[PDB]
């Protein structure tokens, strides 16, 4: 659901698309995640290991 569950009613949203809405609040645009989905997936998977 993302962040909504902390404001009001909880709205569903696909997780590979929540992230492109979390880059956008940093300063890098959202056209970087899709182009690097597999590498960021492996970096996230290896980091938690």
């Amino acid at each position: 659901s993302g962040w909504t569950f902390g404001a009001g009613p909880a709205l569903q949203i696909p997780f590979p698309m929540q992230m492109a809405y979390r880059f956008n609040g940093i300063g890098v645009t959202q056209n970087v995640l899709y182009e690097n989905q597999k590498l960021i997936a492996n970096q996230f998977n290896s980091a938690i290991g």
Binding site: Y34, E35, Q37
Partner: protein, 35 residues
């Protein structure tokens, strides 16, 4: 590279104000090429 991409057309807003011009630009060559 992106997955989940969906085919669609996009309505270009830079076109119709000059497509309306292109509507009358091509009209302006109907009389130009008439004689």
């Amino acid at each position: 590279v992106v997955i989940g991409i969906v085919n669609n057309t996009v309505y270009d807003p830079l076109q119709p104000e000059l497509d309306s011009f292109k509507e009358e630009l091509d009209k302006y060559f109907k009389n130009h090429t008439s004689p």
